[PDB]
């Protein structure tokens, strides 16, 4: 079996992509954020505390004939930004793009943090990391991807995210019309339950490629591209007028600048991020200063190939028993 769904940025900055997901019977369609940096599928529901629900669409497990309570079970998760939700657990039918898993654990938020309440476009998350990151207790639950893999034509999924444009999530096959040349695959470490890999080096603009191992995570659920302080500093020394801003938190540049391109190494292959992708946008509407899309991961603790890097490529997540990550230009 296979699935195909369209994924659309939540705003004109491409901060996040949401994809529709059909949960229960009959189907309630909820717009989820597919996040390769976590492993829970949780959604706003009829259990959610009413003053923390805004404009979101909710799951009501009591209107689904296939819903069952997973008793005993609760979950509580916190994200890189300090945001959080918790609640209890049902199993139910969930379909993406036509691909149907039954007995998928759908985590029901009882409570959600201020940032989730404020985000009217995201009714919850679908985690795509390894299931050893799942928050449900006392037994952890499989992600959608792991439940799907028995029936998939190929145990894979691809991320084809758009720049200011929709894109696609496919499950179970690789669309060979979606990219150009060939996919380079690199090995994935699951030690810390992420899509973790090591890029082989970098170049700024038309300058030389520097062979250097950069271990990071591919994380669809992170907007920007978080690199070690000294690579990011070599990047922004090429845009005159770029400076680090304590106020705003990161490198900022004039919006008028033509930014250079950034290349990152995947094995012997090279993926080039156009410089207009690294122009996140301006730091306030009308402002003449823009925020950069390449920043330090020094206070993170870990390098993150986020949406700005991933949307430059066609990415295959190879979920075989030894997993790998694949990258093609597009």
């Amino acid at each position: 079996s296979t699935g195909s769904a369209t994924t659309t940025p939540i705003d004109s900055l491409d901060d996040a992509y949401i994809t529709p997901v059909q949960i229960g019977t009959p189907a309630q369609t909820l717009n989820l954020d597919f996040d390769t940096g976590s492993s829970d599928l949780w959604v706003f529901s009829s259990e959610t505390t009413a003053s923390e629900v805004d404009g979101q669409t909710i799951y009501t497990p009591s209107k689904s004939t296939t819903a069952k309570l997973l008793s005993g079970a609760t979950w509580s998760i916190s994200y890189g930004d300090g945001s959080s939700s918790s609640g209890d657990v049902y199993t139910d039918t969930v379909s993406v793009g036509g691909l149907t898993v039954t007995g998928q654990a759908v985590e029901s938020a009882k409570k959600v943090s201020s940032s989730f309440t404020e985000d009217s476009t995201i009714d919850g998350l679908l985690g795509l990391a390894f299931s050893t990151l799942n928050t449900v207790s006392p037994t952890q639950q499989k992600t959608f991807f792991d439940n799907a893999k028995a029936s998939l034509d190929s145990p894979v999924f691809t991320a084809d995210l758009g720049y200011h444009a929709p894109g696609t999530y496919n499950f179970g096959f690789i669309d060979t019309t979606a990219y150009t040349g060939s996919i380079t695959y690199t090995a994935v470490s699951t030690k810390q339950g992420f899509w973790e890999w090591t890029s082989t080096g970098y170049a700024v603009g038309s300058g030389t490629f520097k062979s250097t191992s950069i271990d990071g995570i591919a994380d669809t659920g992170t907007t920007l591209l978080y690199l070690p302080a000294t690579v990011v500093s070599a990047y922004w020394a090429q845009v005159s007028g770029a400076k680090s801003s304590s106020s705003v938190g990161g490198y900022v540049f004039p919006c008028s600048a033509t930014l250079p391109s950034f290349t990152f190494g995947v094995g012997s292959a090279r993926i080039v991020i156009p410089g207009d992708y690294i122009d996140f946008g301006p730091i306030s509407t009308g402002s003449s200063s823009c925020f950069g899309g390449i920043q330090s991961s020094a206070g993170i603790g870990i390098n993150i190939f986020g949406d700005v890097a991933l949307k430059a490529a066609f990415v295959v997540f190879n979920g075989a028993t030894t997993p790998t990550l694949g990258f093609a230009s597009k």
Partner: peptide, 8 residues
Amino acid sequence: XPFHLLVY
């Protein structure tokens, strides 16, 4: 603004 949804 920008999102950091790795789990931490």
